[PDB]
């Protein structure tokens, strides 16, 4: 029963008021971001939407989720507000959503504001759990945060390579690579050619993935026929995301700074990941 | 093809024989005997059942585990025994049994005091294996063996609050609460009030699990109206009985001294823990 | 679609050319490679069939895995030569192995006498992946290739016991056993009688394996009526084997020194382990 953004609040303490009935999305969410060895988690509320900030242990990946108020049960906040929430505080709380829960509450209060509140419900039994989690006023990463508007779709032209995976297409590829490499070459010939994943290890072994149909894969490109975008990048950020296997098919776009995008939607849940080269 | 208990026994030196078409509950009960950190089984052979007594690591949380001769597919004791059993001895053996396994067999002869023998039998094949265990004369811890009688249903008035959990609900709320306590406050009004399991850590987290309808797990209070029933109670020996799973669904009766008895019956087994505070 | 020997490979520089619709066979037998710890693999091409050598770490087992080129979708070798492989450095590229993956192909070429081509296809988003992999001209272990004419169905007259597990039962059997020992007994009467599998360790658990139908597990036996067929085995090797689940059924065969065969065929692989007393 979804009824979106609300006017008023159910109770009249609410800065926050936010009810889901997919609050799996979280526990992967949150995988991701344990995955990513975050610390902190910066979250944004405004009337229409909450969005959650982080970056990884090396700072060169950039992760922005946002759910959507008008998407949800009930959301409501009074205005733009920032909270920060240790991720080592919360982990065991993501990871204990099972499919016993059918609701996920949150709630931040005026008269709390150190406090963020996440209520879980068990319907089969009338059981309400009720977290309550110290939080604190983030000082901001601004980097992190104005990275939200460079990946407007807007501003995302000199990206001439994308395709899309779908999360075990993912997942496979990146681990089978990173039990051998930590860097993966990128190259795709301008033109209808196939795409080339690979690595070389000298006196040990090589690697080559191919992809030779680009429909089969989504694959659009740019790249003038003439010429050859080759790339190098990092894929341990990439077997995280891979495996928190957060949402169903991921979109891949590639720049010739061998900047890297991951975008993802699963229901009200949007999940961007920029990651520097 | 359950006979029950037997006037005589098949082989002529038997002191006891036991037989039974469900080996997997003592698969369980021994899980649960690990899970306590148990170092040895103190064991009754009785000529109407066997029982297993135990303590946990810590001294505080009492077994008893009874197996009743008529519920069985043969039993015969001569009389009064006691075996003592190195759990660790006999941890892989238990854990061993499976579904190939239809029949369990224990032997205790006169003429091989320290022996216990444990056989099973795999029909497909026509398979026996026996093992053959060194066991001992135990000296009785006489407080474990008399707790046996501080949990006749005669002796449980002073437990005015309990209820029902299945074997996952009492997995779920355990595990949820050691994620982050070792201990959790159980309080409960007087009246049609709803159950209040929770704890407070300062600075960091706090959690309320709230039961909102009694009826939904079987919960029975004689608490007056105007008291308030509120006990502190230790979660690490629940989340061993939880996880060993030994039985469909688990009664747990509380009293005022914060004493807890979780009792459970599986077919010819019978599971009870009392755990002091 | 199964073409057997070619007279003339596809590429001109192919000394081989390997192709085979079951890659999953190529992952079990490097499982149980290196469940053996075996480092190096030695391997010999043949216009008729490829064979896999190795040993395990204590040397006393010789394994020998052959898959018949007649048997495979497409094969051609020019002549008879040997390669080296580090089977560490192929351990997680043939683990990758999973059901995306419809063809293993095998290429070496002469244009490149240290490399060894493995090429994975995944037919559902047309996606190649190519694996090249170092290998050596091996130093040739005589024993062990000498112990190919050492099982041939000829020479199998001294084994007077014999009979088949499948191979759950292998590896029920034999992780029971290494739960509490490293050697067993093999005891077997002359004449209709059990199979018994057995060890004893005093003061603590003796344990007694016994088959009472010979039919059951297709025993044979060929022990004179009035003699006891007795050996002791070291089972470290056959957990590793069982453990591995290479292949359907398994059969095993005794030898009074003590010596063990295994045998288990899938398909187009044939695998055979002497293990020397």
């Given at each position: 029963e979804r009824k979106g953004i609300?006017?008023?609040?159910?109770?009249?303490?609410?800065?926050l008021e936010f009810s889901y009935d997919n609050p799996l999305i979280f526990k992967n969410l949150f995988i991701y971001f344990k995955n990513l060895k975050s610390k902190n988690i910066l979250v944004r509320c405004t009337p229409t939407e909450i969005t959650f900030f982080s970056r990884d242990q090396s700072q060169a990946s950039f992760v922005i989720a946002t759910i959507d108020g008008?998407?949800?049960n009930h959301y409501y906040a009074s205005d733009v507000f920032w909270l920060g929430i240790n991720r080592e505080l919360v982990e065991k709380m993501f990871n204990s959503?099972?499919?016993?829960?059918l609701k996920i509450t949150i709630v931040h209060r005026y008269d709390k504001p150190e406090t963020l509140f996440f209520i879980f419900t068990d319907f089969d039994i009338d059981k309400e759990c009720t977290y309550q989690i110290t939080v604190s006023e983030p000082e901001l990463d601004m980097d992190l945060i104005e990275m939200e508007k460079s990946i407007s779709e807007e501003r995302l032209?000199?990206?001439?390579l994308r395709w899309e995976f779908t999360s075990k297409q993912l997942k496979k590829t990146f681990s089978d690579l990173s039990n051998y490499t930590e860097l993966v070459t990128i190259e795709k010939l301008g033109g209808d050619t196939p795409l080339h994943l690979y690595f070389q290890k000298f006196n040990s072994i090589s690697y080559h993935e191919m992809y030779k149909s680009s429909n089969k894969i989504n694959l659009t490109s740019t790249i003038p026929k003439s010429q050859v975008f080759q790339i190098n990048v990092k894929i341990a950020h990439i077997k995280s995301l891979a495996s928190a296997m957060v949402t169903d098919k991921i979109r891949i776009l590639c720049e010739e700074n061998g900047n890297l995008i991951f975008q993802s939607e699963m229901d009200a849940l949007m999940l961007n990941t920029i990651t520097l080269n």
């Open positions: 609300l006017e008023k609040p159910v109770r009249p303490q609410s800065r008008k998407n949800v959503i099972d499919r016993s829960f032209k000199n990206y001439p």
